[model samples]
Target: GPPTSDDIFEREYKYGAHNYHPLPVALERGKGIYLWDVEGRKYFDFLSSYSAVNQGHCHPKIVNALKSQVDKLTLTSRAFYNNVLGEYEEYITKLFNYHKVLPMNTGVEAGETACKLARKWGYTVKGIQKYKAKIVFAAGNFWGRTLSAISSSTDPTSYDGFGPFMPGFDIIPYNDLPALERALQDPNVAAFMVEPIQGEAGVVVPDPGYLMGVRELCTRHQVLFIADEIQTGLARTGRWLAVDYENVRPDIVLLGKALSGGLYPVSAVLCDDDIMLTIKPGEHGSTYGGNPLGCRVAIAALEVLEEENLAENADKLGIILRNELMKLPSDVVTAVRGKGLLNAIVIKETKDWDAWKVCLRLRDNGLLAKPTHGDIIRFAPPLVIKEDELRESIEIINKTILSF
Candidate 1:
C-alpha cells in the first residue's frame, strides 16, 4: 500500500537480468565501512562491494579527486594521449614495479587485455604456431562474462548457455603444482593465468610456495605468468598484491577494483615493455580506458592506500577477526580461511539453517556479508576500519551466531 524497499527491487527486476541475487537491503548511502539503507537503517559493510571499495565508500581523497575532475575533462578516447593519462601510467608503473601499463574500464577488461597481450607475445616473441598458441587457466577461474572469459570457466552457471566456446584454452586444477607443470609441457602453451588467492572460488588461498612454484614453472617452460589480482590486490588481502607475499613477479599483472577506490572503473595490465608492447596502438584501445576522470581517481585511490597504511591494517585486523570467529561452535561454522581482509567461513548446512540464513541473520544484527557457495560466506570489510570498530563487528557476529 505504501512505498517500500520491495518497490525498488521490483523496479530493478523489471529491466535487469536475473543474474544478481542481492540481499534485501536497499542501500542509499555509504560512509567508510558503514552503509545506510533506504529507511536509514545502518550496518557494518563486510563485503566491501566485492573488494572494490578497499579504501571504503566515499573515501574523501578519492571522492574529492573525482569531484574535482568531474567538472573538467572526462574522455578524450585513445585518439590522443591526455595529460593525466601519462601521469597515471608513470605513477602506477613505478608503484607496481612494472615497466608499462595498458589501462581499461573493468577487471574483466583487464583480464582480456592480459590474455590478448600474452597471446600476442606468444606469436611474436615465443614463435608460437599461428592460432595454436594456448593459454591455461585455473578450472574455477571467474574473470568475467565475456566470451573469452567464460571459455576458461569451470562453473556451468557461467558458461553453460553461452558457447561454442573459444578454442586454444586449457583448464587445470588450481593450486596444484603438478597439474600446472603438466600443462606447461605443451609446446603451444603461451601463458598460465591464476588468481594469487582465488576470490570468487570462495577465497581459496594456495598453500605456501604455490606462487613461487608457479613463477618457477612458468619460467622453466617459457610460459608467460599472468596474475589476476583484481579482487585480491590493492590491500584487500593485507598486502599491496597477494603475489607480494612470496615476492614473485608475474609476466602480466592484472589489477582493478580498488584501483579507483570504488569511485570509478579503472583496471590495468602491468608488464615490461617487451610483453605490453606486443599489442600495437590500434590493435587495442578502450574509449574510456585512460579517460581523465578515472586516471585522477586511481592516482588518489593509490595515494590513500600508502598514506593510510591500509595494507598493514588489513594484515593486523584479519588475525583478530579470524581468531575470534574460529571460537564459534563447530556445529555451525565448519572452517574459516583467508588472508588479510579477504576471508570466508564454511557453514554446516542443515534443514533449519545454512550460509544464506546466516547472512540474513548478520544483516538483521547490523552486519552485511554474502554467501558464495550455498554454504560458504565471505567476510571482507573495508581496510579503513579501526580495531575497536572491528571488535564491535566481531561481537555482532558472535551474538548472531549464538542466536542460531
Candidate 2:
C-alpha cells in the first residue's frame, strides 16, 4: 500500500528527530537526474544529494554490482579478510595514484580517521610531543558534525552549544597563505586539513594558485596537506579531484558520498605507507568498513565515472550552465561562482527577500535546489546530466529567478 505525503510527513513530525528541515518535496523515486515526489510530480535534482549521486540516482551498473555482492557476502568485520576489499583497495589506490587506502563507512568517520592518523604520525614519526601536535583547519569549513570536526568550524550554527570543543585544532582564514604559514610556524603543527571548494560554504572557490601555494607551504614546513574531498571529488568538479585543477597532490585525501554511488555509506583515506602505516593494528577499524557489498559497489561506481566520461561531460556542461547563469539580471543575482558542475548564485535580495523563498518557487517550477548562508543557492546536479536537460534546467532557473 502506498502512503500519502501528508501521512508520511505527519508520522515523521511526530516520531522522527527534528534535526533536519528538508524541503517540502517528499521524493518517492529517482532515476538519473530526475526525482518523483509521492504525488508523482517530477523535478530535476540540482543538489545530487549533496554530490553523493554524481553517478546519478540508481545507476544500473552500480546497482547490479551491489545486488550481486549482496547475494554472495556482506560483512566480515576486520577480524577476517573479505574477497573484494583487497581488489577495491588496489583499484582506488591505483586510480588516485596513492600508495595505500584506509576504508571507513562514512565521511565523518574518514575525517575522524584522518585526524587520528595525522596526530599519530606527528607523535610517532615527526617526533612531536604527545598532546602538543596541532592540526590547522580553514574558516567557514564544513567537514561533518563530529565534535572534533566542529571544533574548528567558525559557523555559529555548527559550533554553538557544542562545546566544550576539542583542542589541538587551529582555525585560519581560507585561501590565505600568509595565515597558513604563520600557523605552520608552530613546531607542534602536524597537518592542515581543508576542502578544495568548501561546498557547504556556498561553493566558495579559492583564489588561483592558492592550493598550489598550500602544497608548497606544507612541503616546506613538513606539514601534511590533507584534502577533505567528500563533496568535491569523484568527478563532481569535472576532475577526479577538485584540487587536480591546481595539479597539486596532498599528503592525505579523504573520500566519501559518491564512493558507493549513493547506495551505501563508503569512505576512505588515501596516502602513502609512511603516513597510513602510522596507525598500527587494533588502532582503527569499523565493523562494516570494508564489507564486500560496499567494495563492489564502489568499484562499479568508479568504473561508471571513467567509462561514461562524466568528468569531461561535467567540464563542458559546467561552462554552459555558468555562462547562462551569469546572464541573469543583477537585480536577481549578484554573482555566479563555481568550478565545473559545483556552483552557486549569490542573490541580491530586498529586505523581505529570502533565498528559501526563491528555492520554493524553483520547486514549484519543477527544479529542486536549496539555500545556504541566507543569500546563496547551490546548484550541483549530477555529472550525468545531459545537454538538453541542462539547458532546460537553465531556462527553468532563469525564469524562476526573473519571476521573483
Candidate 3:
C-alpha cells in the first residue's frame, strides 16, 4: 500500500536535511497551474516552483523533447561536443541578442560563471591587476547559496556563520545610483552584478531608470553589467526579461529556472566575445553543464515561450490581477506589487495575524502561496494560466483574506 501522508512527512523529517521549511501540504501530482496533495486535494499553484514552471507543469512538447533526447544521448561533458549544444547556444544567443553563451546546469552556476568571467575579463581585457579585481553587488540580492555568491549578500540568514566568505566582492545599496557611481570610482572594479527584479527580496522592483542608470554607469566605467535573471527571466515578468522594461541590454545575462520548463536544470551565461573569450579552455566547466538532455529540453522550453506568446499573456493578465488585488480592503492587504505573473501582497498585520498564517488560510481555501520576509506573500502562478483561472484564484484569495 502507498504510504500515508503523515508517514511520508515523518519519513522526510527523520531522513532528510531540515534546510527547507516547506508548506505543510505534501504535493503528489501537478498539471499546468494546479497541484494535488497526498490526499488528492487540488490547489492552484501560485508559486510555480519559484517561477520555474512558467510554461506550466508537464507540458507535452517539453516532455516529449525530454523523452526523445533521453533515449538518444545525454551526457558528453565539455570534453566532447554534443549535436544539440551548438544549436542551443546559437538559438539562445540570437534570441537574446548576445554573441555567445556558456551553458551550465543551474542558475547559481551561471552566477559563479558570470563572476569568474568578469574577473577574467578584468585581468585579460581591462588590464586590472590579477588578484585585485573587484566585483560590485547590490544589497538585498539573493543569487544563490554558494559561498562566493553569498559573500556579497547582506541577508544575515544567508551568510551568517558561513563566514570567512570569499573575497573580491563589494556590496552597495540597491537603487542607489550614487552608491554605485562611488563604487565605480575604484579602478579595480570589474563588474556590477544586479537582479533586474529582486525576486527573493519580496519582489522588490527598483525605480524606473535604475536599470538604465546601472547600464550607463557600467558603460562609463568599462565595467560589465551582469543581470542575474534566474528568477525573473523566460517570460515570467511579462517580458522576455525583466530588464527589457527598461529597454536596456545587460553586458552579461544569467538565466535558469524556467530554461528547461522545469523538466531539468539548465542555465547559461550570455555575453559578447570580448568578455566570454576570457574563459578559455580548462578555465571552467561542469560535468553535466552542457548535457544533451538539458539542451534539448531548453530548446523546447524556448519554443513554448514563443509559440504560446507567454510574455504578452503575462503582461495582460498581470494588469488584471494587480488591479483586482488592489481592490481588496485595506484591512486585508496593505499593498499589491509585481510584474506579470510575479507579484506579492503585503499582508496587514494585526497583533495576531501575519503572512504565514494568511498562507495557511490560502492553502485551506484551495490555493498554495508562500510567505517571504515576515509580512509579504508572493503569488507567481504559471504564465500559461488562463483569464478565468486567475480570476477564480483572485476570488478565492479575496474570500480567504477577507475572512481573516
Candidate 4:
C-alpha cells in the first residue's frame, strides 16, 4: 500500500536529519506552476525547486524520455562508451553552439569539471606551472557546496568549518573592473568564474555593463570567462542564458538544475575546442555522468524550453512581476529587483525579522517560497507559467508580505 501522509511525515521527522527547517507544506506532487501537498492542498511553487523546474513540474516530454530510457538502458560508467552520451553531447553542443561538452550528474560536479578544465587550460595552453595556476572568484557568489567549490565562495556559512580548503583561488568584488584588472596582471590567473546574477546571494544583479566588462578583461588577459549558470539558465532569467544580456559568450558555461526539467540531475561544461582540450581523456569521469537516462531527459528538456518559448515568456512576465512588487507598501519591502523570474524582495531589516516564518505564512496563503537569509525571500516559478498565474503569484507574495 502507498504511504499515508502522517506515516511518511512522522518517519522523516523521527529519523531524518534536521539540517533544514522547512515550511509546513509537504508536497506530494506538482505540475506546471502548482505544487500539491500530501493532504491535497495546492500552492504556487514560487521558488521553483531552487529553479530546477523551470520547464515546469513533470514536464511531459522530458518525463516520457526519462521513462523510456529507464526501460532501455541507464548507466555504463566511464569504463565503456554509451550511445546516448555522445548524442546528448552533440545536441547540447549544437544548442549552445560550442565545440565540446563534458556531461556530469550535478551542478557541483560540472563546476568542479569547469575548474579543472580552466586550470588545465592555464597549465597546458597558457603555459602556467602546475599547482600554481589561480582562478579569480567573484564576491557574493554561490557555485556549490563542494570543498573546492565552497573554498571559492564568498558566503561565510559555506566556508566556515569547511576549512583547510583548496588553494590557488582569489576572491574579488563582482563587477569591479579595477579589482579584476589587478588580478589579470597576475598572468597565472586562469579564469574568472561568476554567476550572471548571484542567485545564492539573493538575486544580486551586477551593475550594467559589468558582465561585458568582465568579458573584455578576460579577453585582454587571455583568461577563460566561466559562467556558473546553474540557477539562471534554461529561461529562468527571461533569456536562454542570463549572460545573454551582455551579448557576451563565455569560454565555458556550467549548466544544471532546469536542464533536466527537475526530473534528474544533469549538468555540463560546454566550451570551444581550444579551452576544452586542455583536460586529457580519462582525466575525469563520473559513474552517472552521461548516462542514457540523463541524456534523454536533458535533450527533451532543451527541446521543451525552445518549443514552449519559455525564455520569451520569462522576459515578458518578469517586468510585470518586478514592477508590481516594487509598488507594494515599503513597510515590508525595502527594495525589489531581478532578471526574469529570478527575483527577490528585501525586508526592511533582516536582523529582527524571521524570513522562515514569513515563508510559512506564504505556505498558508497557497504559495511556496524559501528564504535565503534572515530577511530575503526569493521568487522563481516555472518558466511555462501563464501571465494570469504570474499575477496570482504576485498576489500571493503581497498577501504573505502583509501577513509578516
RMSD of each: 1.2, 0.8, 0.9, 1.6
lDDT values, one for every candidate: 0.93, 0.93, 0.93, 0.89
lDDT of 1: 0.93
Supply every candidate's count of residue pairs whose N, Cα or C atoms clash at under 3 angstroms: 0, 0, 0, 0
What tens digits encode model 1's per-residue C-alpha lDDT throughout 1-404? 54567888998899989889998888888999999888789999999988889999999999899989889888988798778999999999999999999999999999999989989999999999899999999988999999999999999999998999999989999999999999998979999999999988998999999999999999999999999999999998889999999999999999999999898989999999999888886898888999999999999999999999999999999999899989999987999999999989988888778888888999999999999977899999999999999999999988988898
| TM-scores for every predicted model | 0.98, 0.99, 0.99, 0.96
Model 1 worst lDDT run, 10 consecutive residues: 1-10
Candidate 2 lDDT over residue span 162-241, tens digit each:
89999899999999999999999997999999999999989999999999999999999999999999999999888999
Worst 10 residues of 3 by lDDT: 1-10
For candidate 4, what is the lDDT? 0.89
Q: What TM-score does candidate 3 get on C-alpha atoms?
A: 0.99
TM-score of 2: 0.99
| Root-mean-square deviation of candidate 2 | 0.8
Over the full model, what C-alpha lDDT does candidate 2 score relative to the true structure? 0.93
- Give the TM-score (vs. native) of candidate 4: 0.96
In the range 1-404, model 4's lDDT, one tens digit per residue, is 76676777777899999766666667889898988887788988988888889988998899899999998888888788878888888889999889989889898998899999999889998999877999999989888889998998878878998799899989999868899999899989999999999998889999999989989999999999999999998888988899999898999999999999999998989999998887777798888988889899999999999999999999899999999999988887888989999999888765557778788788888988888888888888888999999888888888778765
